[PDB]
Amino acid sequence: MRTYTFDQVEKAIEQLYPDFTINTIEISGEGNDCIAYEINRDFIFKFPKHSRGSTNLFNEVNILKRIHNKLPLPIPEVVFTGMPSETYQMSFAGFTKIKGVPLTPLLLNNLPKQSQNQAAKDLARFLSELHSINISGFKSNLVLDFREKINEDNKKIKKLLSRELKGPQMKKVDDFYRDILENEIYFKYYPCLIHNDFSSDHILFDTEKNTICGIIDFGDAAISDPDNDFISLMEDDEEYGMEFVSKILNHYKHKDIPTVLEKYRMKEKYWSFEKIIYGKEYGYMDWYEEGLNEIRSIKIK
Numbered sequence: 001m002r003t004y005t006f007d008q009v010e011k012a013i014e015q016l017y018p019d020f021t022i023n024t025i026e027i028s029g030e031g032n033d034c035i036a037y038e039i040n041r042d043f044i045f046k047f048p049k050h051s052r053g054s055t056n057l058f059n060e061v062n063i064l065k066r067i068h069n070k071l072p073l074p075i076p077e078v079v080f081t082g083m084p085s086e087t088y089q090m091s092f093a094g095f096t097k098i099k100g101v102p103l104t105p106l107l108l109n110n111l112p113k114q115s116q117n118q119a120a121k122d123l124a125r126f127l128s129e130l131h132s133i134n135i136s137g138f139k140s141n142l143v144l145d146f147r148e149k150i151n152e153d154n155k156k157i158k159k160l161l162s163r164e165l166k167g168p169q170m171k172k173v174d175d176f177y178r179d180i181l182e183n184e185i186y187f188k189y190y191p192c193l194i195h196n197d198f199s200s201d202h203i204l205f206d207t208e209k210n211t212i213c214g215i216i217d218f219g220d221a222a223i224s225d226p227d228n229d230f231i232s233l234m235e236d237d238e239e240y241g242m243e244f245v246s247k248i249l250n251h252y253k254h255k256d257i258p259t260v261l262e263k264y265r266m267k268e269k270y271w272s273f274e275k276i277i278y279g280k281e282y283g284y285m286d287w288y289e290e291g292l293n294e295i296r297s298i299k300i301k
Contacts, residue, residue: 022040057089074213076098135193173295200238
């Protein structure tokens with residue numbers, strides 16, 4: 001983990017862009033990969049907190065340049081790029097700030113009915129065009145391998161929990177991933193370009209027009225299972241729920257909704273294990289103890 005002061009941020013940008021005058025700067029947000037800075041009210045600069053974060057940002061930049069003006073909703077435009085350095089492919093990047101506010105489930109719900117329906121449609125058409133983008137000229141490392149992800153989470157959790165879980169409890173972790181790995185449904189799909197973090201936080205909304213005005217944060221985007229872009233919208237507390245996602249699925253013309261529902265059912269339990277990782281890292285007691293209670297509740301077979 002690498003941190004930044006405002007001065008370090010400003011100095012880095014000025015070094016590469018002497019004639020870009022920085023009048024205002026504030027911290028706009030912070031996720032697992034980057035800190036976001038709003039500069040001069042109209043740009044979002046992301047700085048990576050780790051090499052993985054820097055790779056993801058390098059990826060975002062490349063993907064955004066590649067699909068610029070290609071989609072039915074506006075996405076950020078790359079205006080500034082940093083430099084490579086050591087384990088960091090991309091020292092920072094600057095994007096045009098799209099105006100709008102997140103389409104939260106709350107916000108979605110208080111919306112007129114005609115407008116709730118239009119949002120479902122616009123989202124469906126966005127994902128449809130996104131998932132139709134030709135995948136032929138992407139490097140193979142942009143193709144996600146869920147088996148690889150599974151095997152990594154399994155290994156992380158075991159090391160993470162080595163001083164907490166007795167042998168029999170640890171076996172439940174291995175068995176949970178084994179079971180997942182044995183099911184073709186999760187691995188036999190047609191790969192395509194996906195957002196990969198397609199949720200309310202990353203959908204921007206225009207409260208004058210009552211329409212969605214952007215999609216943002218392409219730092220996780222990759223070649224993967226397109227069903228993942230619907231599943232990231234389904235969770236009931238934090239996201240949209242099935243009545244809204246169903247409308248999206250129908251406008252998108254999905255041919256196997258039952259399979260999508262099955263994958264969400266797997267992901268529910270999956271998220272709980274994943275959250276142990278971030279949970280122990282960020283020191284969130286909710287994510288950690290819940291996941292740990294889940295493991296203990298498991299009976300093999």
